[PDB]
Write a protein that binds this ligand. Sequence first.
Ligand SMILES: Nc1nc2c(ncn2[C@@H]2O[C@H](COP(=O)(O)OP(=O)(O)OP(=O)(O)O)[C@@H](O)[C@H]2O)c(=O)[nH]1
Ligand SMILES: Nc1nc2c(ncn2[C@@H]2O[C@H](COP(=O)(O)OP(=O)(O)OP(=O)(O)O)[C@@H](O)[C@H]2O)c(=O)[nH]1
Ligand SMILES: Nc1nc2c(ncn2[C@@H]2O[C@H](COP(=O)(O)OP(=O)(O)OP(=O)(O)O)[C@@H](O)[C@H]2O)c(=O)[nH]1
Ligand SMILES: Nc1nc2c(ncn2[C@@H]2O[C@H](COP(=O)(O)OP(=O)(O)OP(=O)(O)O)[C@@H](O)[C@H]2O)c(=O)[nH]1
Ligand SMILES: Nc1nc2c(ncn2[C@@H]2O[C@H](COP(=O)(O)OP(=O)(O)OP(=O)(O)O)[C@@H](O)[C@H]2O)c(=O)[nH]1
Ligand SMILES: Nc1nc2c(ncn2[C@@H]2O[C@H](COP(=O)(O)OP(=O)(O)OP(=O)(O)O)[C@@H](O)[C@H]2O)c(=O)[nH]1
Ligand SMILES: O=c1ccn([C@@H]2O[C@H](COP(=O)(O)OP(=O)(O)O)[C@@H](O)[C@H]2O)c(=O)[nH]1
Lengths: 230, 226, 231, 227, 220, 230
Amino acid sequence: SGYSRVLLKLGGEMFGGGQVGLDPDVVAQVARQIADVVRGGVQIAVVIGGGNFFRGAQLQQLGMERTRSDYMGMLGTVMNSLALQDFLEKEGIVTRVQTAITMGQVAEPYLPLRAVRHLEKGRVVIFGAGMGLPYFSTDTTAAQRALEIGADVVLMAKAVDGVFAEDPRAELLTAVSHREVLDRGLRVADATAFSLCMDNGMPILVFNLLTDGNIARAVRGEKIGTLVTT
Amino acid sequence: GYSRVLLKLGGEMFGGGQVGLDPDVVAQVARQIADVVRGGVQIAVVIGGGNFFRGAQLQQLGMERTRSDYMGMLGTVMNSLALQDFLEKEGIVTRVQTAITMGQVAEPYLPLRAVRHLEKGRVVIFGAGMGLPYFSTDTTAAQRALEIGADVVLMAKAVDGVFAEDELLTAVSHREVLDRGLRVADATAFSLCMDNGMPILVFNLLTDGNIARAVRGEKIGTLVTT
Amino acid sequence: QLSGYSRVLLKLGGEMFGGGQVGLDPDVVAQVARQIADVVRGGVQIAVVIGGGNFFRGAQLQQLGMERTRSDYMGMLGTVMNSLALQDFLEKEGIVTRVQTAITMGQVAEPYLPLRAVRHLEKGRVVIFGAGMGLPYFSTDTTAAQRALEIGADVVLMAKAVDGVFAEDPAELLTAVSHREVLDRGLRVADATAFSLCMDNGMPILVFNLLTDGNIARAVRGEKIGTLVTT
Amino acid sequence: LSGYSRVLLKLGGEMFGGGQVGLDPDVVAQVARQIADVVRGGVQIAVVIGGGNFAQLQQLGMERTRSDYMGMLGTVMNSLALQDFLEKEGIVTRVQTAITMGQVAEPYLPLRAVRHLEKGRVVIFGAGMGLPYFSTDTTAAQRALEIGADVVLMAKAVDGVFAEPEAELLTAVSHREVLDRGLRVADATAFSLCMDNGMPILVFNLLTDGNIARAVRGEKIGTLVTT
Amino acid sequence: SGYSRVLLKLGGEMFGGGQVGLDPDVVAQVARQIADVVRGGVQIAVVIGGGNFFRGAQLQQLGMERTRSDYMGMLGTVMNSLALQDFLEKEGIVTRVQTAITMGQVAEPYLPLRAVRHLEKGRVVIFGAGMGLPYFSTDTTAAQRALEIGADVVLMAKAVDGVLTAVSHREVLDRGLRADATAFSLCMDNGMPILVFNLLTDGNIARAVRGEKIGTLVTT
Amino acid sequence: SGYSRVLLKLGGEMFGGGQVGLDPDVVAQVARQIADVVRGGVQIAVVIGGGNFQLQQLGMERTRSDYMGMLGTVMNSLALQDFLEKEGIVTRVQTAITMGQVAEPYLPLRAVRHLEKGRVVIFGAGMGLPYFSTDTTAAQRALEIGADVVLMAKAVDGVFAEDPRVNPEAELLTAVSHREVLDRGLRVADATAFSLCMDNGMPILVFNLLTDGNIARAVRGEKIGTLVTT
Ligand SMILES: Nc1nc2c(ncn2[C@@H]2O[C@H](COP(=O)(O)OP(=O)(O)OP(=O)(O)O)[C@@H](O)[C@H]2O)c(=O)[nH]1
Ligand SMILES: Nc1nc2c(ncn2[C@@H]2O[C@H](COP(=O)(O)OP(=O)(O)OP(=O)(O)O)[C@@H](O)[C@H]2O)c(=O)[nH]1
Ligand SMILES: Nc1nc2c(ncn2[C@@H]2O[C@H](COP(=O)(O)OP(=O)(O)OP(=O)(O)O)[C@@H](O)[C@H]2O)c(=O)[nH]1
Ligand SMILES: Nc1nc2c(ncn2[C@@H]2O[C@H](COP(=O)(O)OP(=O)(O)OP(=O)(O)O)[C@@H](O)[C@H]2O)c(=O)[nH]1
Ligand SMILES: Nc1nc2c(ncn2[C@@H]2O[C@H](COP(=O)(O)OP(=O)(O)OP(=O)(O)O)[C@@H](O)[C@H]2O)c(=O)[nH]1
Ligand SMILES: Nc1nc2c(ncn2[C@@H]2O[C@H](COP(=O)(O)OP(=O)(O)OP(=O)(O)O)[C@@H](O)[C@H]2O)c(=O)[nH]1
Ligand SMILES: O=c1ccn([C@@H]2O[C@H](COP(=O)(O)OP(=O)(O)O)[C@@H](O)[C@H]2O)c(=O)[nH]1
């Protein structure tokens, strides 16, 4: 008894897989995994970060205002999205990109009602350029997009396949509540992103995506990673 | 003293409420923002839109949350346009920037523009929230305050401050508000402020001179710093 | 060739929305949604223009000291409040409804694209034209006229608080008059500018009381109630 | 002499080609020179042109709506032509269009339009009001009101409005009177707009050079409809 | 052979006669020709010039900025586009008008991905307002749009039958044969074919789209 | 006989130095060179390429690849803007693709206005059209603003008289005509961009920005690089 639609959050750093820019192998793994989800019947939107595109940084510890570096990140996210679109399309998966800041020529504008329409036709929707606002993390973009599209859950792709009870200098939980996560003293996401989720009862699912087969199992409701709930 | 502030108000303040828009309150409020400005302070303002909803009928009655949100955002703009007029009448040059671009109605959201407006000695009213549902006016206020590099978020309430808990407190840390166990603002709004170290001063605007009291550094309503 | 009107611009006043008072009384809105729904189900095409008196004219605020242009936009914003409310209710009636705003408000609704509004109509969806025409110094009645024109409406339906146009300010109720006859028998106020626009393009106007349940349906049916203004 | 701080001049598009299709460079230079007379006299001036110089199309099929958009685009071409000729006469001019058209011209923004007028620039408003079924007359009205104009100058081809042998030209008439039988100074919509707002209209003969400058000083020119 | 999809470039200077303005007997006759091409199952995009609304080059001679001229031309091309659209719709051909300068409800934004979608639905697409940029000819707009919609050939409508029946891109450079230089380079660098043919002689469009030996082909 | 306003073209590759992304040494160096020119009273607009962020040789469709590049050029612009500003120079970025908060709309008349106030204008996002080089974007914008010259930064300080693959021991030019460039196979810019310039009498000056003082020499009218004039 799993999920009908989900929002998947990838960090920008993932796409470069250390180092800077795009490792087209990594992005291939991800497209392939996202396809398994589509074919499994489930509807998926993706929110990607933009970290892979500066050293770094470097830019900030080095002069740049947060405001400007956030806009650079947003532009990064949109490069990430177009690359992913392309790998998904060669995978047979029809994909659309909507950008928070409207970039007429490059992609579609952010219109959640049209996005839902896309999902309902078995298209992946990718959400680029965050929320178009400095001071919000990708996590927070993820939470809010999951809400707008009415996602059943926000799938958080980490490198750790769950959430450890206490730092291991230890077993990772399978399922904890929102209050438990906050109430001494864990860290699933950025606090702001977590607040949005908590105040709206959005389930978060922390898991490793690059472990082949994870996401298709996750979306079947198959107890992988750590499910935050209430 | 505070050099530049974000003043936040719930839409219901503009109701003197009562529902809708009371002009003597808008007048009163523009009169006092006018004093703060003539004093040399820079002021960005953020108003909610709650005063145009009868309590919460249609939200209850079955409106999509997203559609309520947008109705509220339209509310904010109606309040913004109103305040603009009463300030201009008060002699003070006022711009309205909307998160939702509404061509002729107001300027678009341009943070660098807004700062340049402020340093030219104008008021900037930020309207339509952030154009994004599932976010409150307090969150709009926080983000806007961070963008424009404001010293504090002033939260004009119809209460003297923050208590514990209906014993009005006077100074607390951000950390201290979480651990037990207060409500200064929206959960999501508070986090944004805290994750960035942004001060928040909660005071009663209903007693005259309180905004002036607040900005010039007088103590106080409840200040929250970390 | 079918009977009554095929597509129709329904002009609804904002005060009637309303109460009563400032803002929105959902019972009124819900009642109006249901009547519109019945008419739509039978395959009449309806586009709606809503007023803003429950929030602001005008016009009004100009007198009060406020800047006219600013005040007009507040009124137009008020009409988008109403437009979203009516949308929510029509939906709950099982009627697909689209709001097009004259002032693009990206996230909030669709832009004003009239050829697309007509496509909506052809698919059996109601379209609510909000934000007026987006042009200060104009009223919603003129919006109603203009929009009727763009979408090739058969008639403007003026749903007022009284049952038609009377000969002289109050009887009698005139069932049928000319656009010209209105200025000849000086039968203000249906809004001169809005009226002139309909007169210059031979756009029929039916003025009728919406407060009597079932009256919209009668209007649409080519049934003789209120006042039909032609030309 | 009374006279006007700020005015809106309305021109029919057909005049610009007069009377061949497209643009007559003499006529446009003649119009520019009169407008420069107005800015020389220290009066602020906004202009609204029609687009008829570029509806037999309706005759053989075309939707009125689509024909109207065609005209709207014509008005912008006319606006651009007049701007150019004004710039030659040393007059700084901006064009704002009702429908935003990006790099071709400024968006329509009344408060910025008056900021230009205050700086002594000419503003030209194009693309009607961006909506079919409205006349150029009506656009002129609506724009005049938005920019807080003192009058709408209707450039016309006759000296004004008569009671006609030879008889008297009407120097000054009330709105109520024009209406109360039975003259057209603008179309009913345009005229209605002005009357509900107390907006004067001055119908005059642009063809005689010196006239608009005489009008704006407050000299007795043409037919003033007050108000 | 055939062409599955083709971009047809029309000089504005033919929608008038010219004389100056719009000649409906010429626009209607062009709609007619395009309608056959559509009915016969080909997908076609149109790029139109704006020169029929100018009086010689009177304005440019009198000191008009190119910038401002080119902008006048663009608005010209939108005028022609809407005329053609109208005449095509009267022929039962569903037609959409995309403008490089976005123009609200006058016509659609330039969005080549939906252009291709309109095409796939049988619709005709007319591109107006050039590329929304001065210093670029109609030929260049023709080339680029041809490239963006993945067209098979640029059909260059002319008053002369061709240039000669078939050549390469380099041969044209070598010999010195005459489209606009900058336009031609865009096509050469992407191997885009160009068919210069005489739109005037009737039925000549329906010939080209069936791969028939007509005019001049600049396939490399 | 110096120049009053100039359009400086900068290759993306430049900014990488010569790895992926942004080297804040290379950009600081470029910023100062430009700051020397502005302080001098000369007016300068800048057009930046996007290479620093091969993939089309991986299936990526041309159109989409071009947009990747354009997005890169906006990143570069914002980076240069940050360095110019900290060099004391007020600078505005205009993007061919409209990006709300990120930069300005492309609006040349407004750009000229910025140049007259002694501000630098950086033109980002190419011309928002696929199938068009950076050189072409520079040629077009140069003409839009009424530039005197396109300044064309290359690490080789000139144009060879013959292709070095035909004559290994060529040999730099100092001055040539546009025709002289055309007949032959001289190598100034790509074909499309050179046509724009030649047909409009736009001079192009090829020179090496990275040796200090070189741009200052160029704008003053000193004999520097290769100058193509008709
Ligand atoms: N609705 C709307 N109004 C605008 C916009 N941009 C400028 N304005 C208005 O234009 C008017 C004049 O201001 P600007 O032209 O921007 O010039 P400024 O930066 O304010 O400086 P000044 O020249 O002293 O006026 C003001 O009333 C602004 O509100 C806009 O994008 N939308
Ligand atoms: N993203 C974006 N930023 C803008 C836009 N317009 C102005 N800005 C920014 O706003 C800030 C202040 O500029 P303005 O108040 O608009 O006036 P300005 O033209 O930049 O400066 P002056 O002409 O001297 O008054 C600048 O730092 C600009 O970067 C815009 O349309 N988009
Ligand atoms: N807020 C807003 N919503 C829009 C806008 N454009 C489309 N939508 C919404 O997107 C949803 C999906 O429909 P669309 O993608 O517009 O196309 P459609 O023709 O209405 O739907 P189909 O019948 O599938 O063709 C509808 O609810 C529209 O109202 C817009 O510009 N703003
Ligand atoms: N195409 C187009 N041009 C614009 C737009 N906004 C401004 N411009 C042009 O830019 C040039 C310079 O004007 P601005 O930078 O806006 O400032 P300004 O109005 O000249 O104000 P001051 O120079 O301080 O008097 C003028 O030629 C304007 O017409 C626009 O939105 N579109
Ligand atoms: N001017 C302008 N017209 C538009 C725009 N979008 C759509 N239209 C018009 O609206 C009508 C198309 O309706 P759509 O529903 O969007 O067309 P579609 O993609 O085939 O889907 P359906 O018509 O719903 O079956 C046509 O007349 C279009 O020309 C726009 O952005 N600008
Ligand atoms: N760049 C860009 N592409 C767009 C935009 N809107 C639609 N498209 C593209 O146009 C192509 C066809 O889209 P549409 O014409 O809207 O059709 P659709 O919405 O996908 O849905 P159907 O045609 O009903 O199946 C897609 O590849 C879209 O990405 C836009 O705003 N910007
Ligand atoms: O095109 C329009 C449409 C309406 N409005 C404003 O919106 C207000 C409310 O509309 P209206 O007066 O028609 O409301 P109603 O009388 O129908 O309740 C008007 O008073 C105007 O101020 C406007 O300025 N232009």
